[PDB]
């Protein structure tokens, strides 16, 4: 419906699910990454000690943590060790948001079936590769 499609964002799904552990023990993420276009709705998540755009003071400097809730009809998936697949990524404001939680309301009713996700801004860190 109209309100469920107010926002348009990009989603990076690792289509391949062939991640494995090297002969040295390091983790190697699935190789084939694919970009997609999706539509949904993004709002701040107000609950308990959740931190939306909260500035954090540390001895090392300053951080910024954010988290949101997303309503959409697209089936995004989080990490699953039994099915052996990794989570998706959602691009908001040019930054990455990793899908951490999911709530399956699909197949409940005709016109109001949807999904809910809690997406957390990814922390800043340097990059390293282990590919075999």
């Amino acid at each position: 419906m109209r309100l469920l499609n107010r926002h348009s964002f990009v989603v990076k799904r690792k289509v391949s699910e062939d991640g494995y552990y090297n002969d040295d023990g390091d983790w190697v993420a699935s190789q084939d990454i694919v970009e997609v276009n999706c539509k949904g709705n993004i709002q701040p998540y107000i609950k308990g000690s959740v931190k939306n755009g909260t500035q954090i003071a540390l001895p090392e400097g300053i951080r910024l943590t954010d988290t949101r809730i997303l309503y959409t009809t697209y089936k995004l998936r989080t990490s699953d060790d039994v099915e052996w697949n990794e989570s998706d990524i959602v691009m908001i404001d040019g930054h990455e948001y990793e899908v951490f939680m999911t709530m399956d309301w699909s197949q409940q009713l005709a016109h109001t079936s949807h999904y809910e996700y809690i997406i957390i801004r990814r922390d800043k860190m340097n990059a390293v590769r282990n590919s075999r």
Binding site: N126, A127, V128, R129
Partner: protein, 107 residues
């Protein structure tokens, strides 16, 4: 004091063939602190006691690494030249460092 002809007779036998990049000064020990895999490089025949590279060389640097010096190696794995880059360059992610040209002088 060498003449131009002797200089040209000399430089023709140097035959550098590859280039490697280091982060620590390799003058004292070129075997250590390697950061990138060897890459091919070509030179022209000497003139005026000088040899210059014949084309650009694209070197791939791994993520989170730094490069500050270089070194040239023969066809038989011996270091014959060392030097410093224009800037110490830090690569946030994998990229290409472009070698415009390099020359060796006897003047």
């Amino acid at each position: 004091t060498l003449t131009i002809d002797g200089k040209n007779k000399i430089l023709a036998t140097l035959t550098p063939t590859t280039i490697i990049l280091h982060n620590v000064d390799p003058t004292a020990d070129p075997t250590a602190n390697k950061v990138t895999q060897p890459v091919a490089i070509y030179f022209s025949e000497p003139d005026n006691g000088l040899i210059a590279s014949e084309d650009t060389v694209n070197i791939t640097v791994p993520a989170s690494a730094t490069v500050s010096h270089y070194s040239l190696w023969d066809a038989n794995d011996k270091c014959v030249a060392t030097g410093a880059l224009s800037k110490p360059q830090f690569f946030a992610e994998e990229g290409i460092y472009v070698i415009s040209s390099v020359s060796v002088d006897l003047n």
